[PDB]
């Protein structure tokens, strides 16, 4: 008699959805699939605008610090770099502020997260020759 091979049979055909240990998955995917498109369309656009004006970019940041804190804590001489701007995007997923000390987002004190400029392992890996929907801005053309 195969015992391990038949595991989970009882909770497959003789169990209710509301009377089982299985949790729903559609709820998480609802807010996850939508956020992927936001980072793709607004990703390159944000970086292009930041790099549009190479010089004189740090002047705006320096003046802003004189109004919030008054005294420039990060002040440095002309012979030292001020900072490096990193293209970040806002958070759209309504995550709950859990009390997990080992979490990566529970201790977030700002509404902006870094964006990877290059990725070698695409998350939406297709199972075949099919492409990803919404990744063809230019309309198609037929030989006619």
């Amino acid at each position: 008699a195969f015992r391990y091979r038949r595991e989970g049979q009882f909770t497959k055909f003789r169990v209710h959805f509301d009377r089982s240990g299985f949790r729903p998955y559609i709820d998480e995917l609802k807010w996850e699939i939508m956020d992927w498109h936001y980072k793709r369309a607004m990703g390159p656009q944000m970086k292009k605008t930041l790099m549009s004006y190479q010089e004189g970019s740090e002047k705006l940041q320096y003046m802003h610090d004189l109004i919030a804190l008054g005294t420039a804590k990060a002040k440095f001489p002309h012979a030292t770099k001020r900072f490096f701007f990193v293209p970040a995007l806002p958070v759209t997923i309504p995550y709950r502020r859990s009390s997990n000390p080992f979490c990566l987002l529970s201790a977030n004190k700002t509404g902006w997260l870094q964006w990877s400029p290059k990725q070698r392992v695409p998350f939406p890996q297709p199972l075949g020759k099919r492409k990803v929907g919404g990744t063809d801005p230019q309309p198609p053309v037929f030989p006619k």
Binding site: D27, E28, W31, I93, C103, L105
Partner: protein
């Protein structure tokens, strides 16, 4: 080919003056707002008078017969302002709380169990994560013969195990964990007050 032949606007007679002058009837989109308490009572008076007028049904007399049965046994609010005290508030008033952490409230062993969910940040809260129950052994608790019988009678045999001889008390009438936890501790003390009599 089909479903395309249009029709001219034939509504042009001078007789049709009462048209396009007022908002249409109530729409389902405007029903978002709730019904005021004045209108809900009006419908009850209009419907009760219609049924007695002669609008009877085969399944209407059977309902009345069942209601009359509960009257004889004495399960009706029929009598041949008020400011009462709710049972929950009454228990709060009568409760001997401890004076600081170093004072023992109870005088018998007891185990408290509760499930706490931990994991990655979930977009939604997981239900069925606010249970709290207390267990205690009757054999360890020293009591008289008359008092011991009453303990199992109030809770019944469902909350008592005949193999080991332990009693489990579960209370879950609140969504929050903190609110539910405090509720268990109040009812537990009240039970002992009536048992010793």
């Amino acid at each position: 080919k089909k479903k395309r032949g249009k029709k001219e606007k034939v509504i042009l007679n001078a007789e049709q003056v009462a048209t396009k002058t007022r908002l249409p009837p109530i729409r389902l989109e405007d029903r978002i707002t709730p019904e005021p308490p004045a209108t809900v009572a009006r419908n009850i008076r209009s419907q009760i008078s219609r049924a007695v007028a002669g609008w009877k049904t085969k399944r209407m007399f059977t309902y009345r017969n069942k209601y009359r049965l509960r009257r004889l046994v004495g399960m009706t609010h029929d009598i041949d302002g008020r400011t009462f005290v709710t049972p929950l508030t009454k228990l709060q008033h009568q409760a001997a709380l401890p004076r600081s952490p170093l004072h023992a409230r109870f005088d018998f062993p007891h185990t408290v169990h509760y499930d706490v969910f931990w994991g990655p940040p979930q977009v939604e809260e997981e239900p069925n994560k606010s249970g709290c129950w207390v267990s205690f052994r009757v054999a360890d608790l020293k009591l008289s013969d008359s008092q011991e019988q009453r303990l199992l009678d109030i809770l019944g045999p469902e909350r008592y195990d005949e193999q080991t001889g332990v009693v489990c008390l579960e209370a879950d009438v609140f969504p929050q964990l903190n609110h539910n936890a405090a509720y268990l501790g109040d009812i537990l003390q009240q039970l002992m007050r009536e048992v010793k009599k």
